């Protein structure tokens, strides 16, 4: 079929985190921030073409929570099975030395939706203009998330994306250079 | 131009 519009919510205990997002043909439209209780368009431009009062999603999320407590009691506190992710580090544009680019770390086919992702420059942790998508939904109910390191091609310069998912024995780490 | 949401109800 031609197009898809997924409204994906989740709640998880005891980390007590929510996500409420809208997807289209695989890319996020917007999501609601639980802390700032505000709509957050994936691209700023979408704010111009539509709106969504965030209080509806926090209503829903708070109904998701109660339903979690119920299913746990009903399921005899059987935990979620941790499925660990696969990973890809790759440049956003083609690489040309001295010209700004973005390094994408894409984390795929994992559950549950918790990640400790750490971007690394020549072995030194690095955070400058770092961004990440929300946890994106999949048809098998596992997840994917996108991490972005704004960076400058360099030849003599290696970047590592490390993830401390507790579906892993040891950190998963993928390198990239010129 | 407004997106509209479906809501779940609860379980006793």
């Amino acid at each position: 079929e031609d197009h898809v519009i997924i409204q994906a919510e989740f709640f998880m205990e005891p980390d007590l985190t929510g996500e409420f997002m809208f997807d289209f043909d695989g890319d996020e439209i917007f999501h609601v921030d639980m802390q700032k209780k505000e709509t957050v368009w994936r691209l700023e431009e979408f704010g111009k073409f539509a709106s969504f009062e965030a209080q509806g999603a926090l209503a829903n999320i708070a109904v998701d929570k109660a339903n979690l407590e119920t299913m746990m009691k009903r399921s005899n506190y059987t935990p979620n099975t941790n499925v660990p992710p696969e990973m890809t580090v790759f440049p956003n544009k083609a690489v040309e030395l001295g010209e700004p680019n973005i390094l994408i770390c894409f984390i795929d086919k994992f559950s549950p939706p918790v990640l400790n992702v750490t971007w690394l420059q020549n072995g030194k942790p690095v955070t400058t203009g770092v961004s990440e998508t929300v946890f994106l939904p999949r048809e098998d109910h596992l997840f994917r998330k996108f991490y972005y390191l704004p960076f400058l091609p360099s030849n003599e310069d290696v970047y590592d994306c490390k993830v401390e998912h507790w579906g892993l024995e040891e950190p998963l780490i993928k390198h990239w250079e010129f | 131009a407004s997106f509209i949401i479906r809501s779940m109800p609860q379980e006793t």
């Binding site: 519009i5 289209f24 695989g26 099975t81 790759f90 972005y148 | 509209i4």
Partner: protein, 177 residues
């Protein structure tokens, strides 16, 4: 160590505009679909035992059932209306550039949306051509690394050709040997 997870996912599938609209409500506990309302069925179906009571109870809720039955209109058709206005027909043309690897040349289509594309090589062929496939960059752009092995034959031209529905006119980029 003991995490417990619950996913609600409301799905609208559209074909041929909005003359084919499928609604899917799914309740997913620890990654297993338990109960699902599907518009083409018209009622909740318990996928696992854990559902029965809810599906039973929800189909008994005559008022909510009509809400769900009607969602292909009030929810799907509506939300698609709003999308048609910017998202649905979003095009963004690629940024096609060629170079050697690590002979083996690499046609690098970048920044294109939506995904569907036709990348090809020529010697002014099929064999020697290796693609990554379509790659979500998560910013509503795709890329694709279509590479091609080649003996560096003297004064021969390799053209990488890219017809995407962004601009009717095909982008093409050359590399002389």
């Amino acid at each position: 160590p003991a995490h417990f997870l619950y996913q609600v996912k409301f799905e609208c599938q559209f074909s041929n505009g909005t003359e084919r609209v499928r609604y899917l409500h799914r309740s997913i506990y620890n990654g297993q679909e338990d109960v699902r309302f599907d518009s083409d069925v018209g009622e909740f179906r318990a996928l696992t035992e854990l559902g029965r009571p809810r599906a039973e109870y929800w189909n008994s809720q005559k008022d909510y059932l009509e809400d769900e039955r009607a969602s292909v209109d009030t929810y799907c058709r509506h939300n698609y209306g709003v999308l048609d206005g910017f998202l649905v027909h979003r095009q963004t043309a690629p940024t096609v550039t060629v170079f050697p690897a690590k002979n083996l040349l690499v046609c690098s289509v970048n920044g294109f949306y939506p995904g569907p594309i036709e990348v090809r090589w020529l010697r002014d062929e099929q064999a020697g051509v290796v693609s990554t496939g379509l790659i979500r960059n998560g910013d509503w752009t795709f890329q694709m690394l279509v590479m091609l092995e080649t003996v560096p034959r003297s004064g021969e031209v390799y053209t990488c050709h890219v017809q995407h529905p962004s601009s009717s006119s095909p982008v093409t980029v050359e590399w002389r040997a």
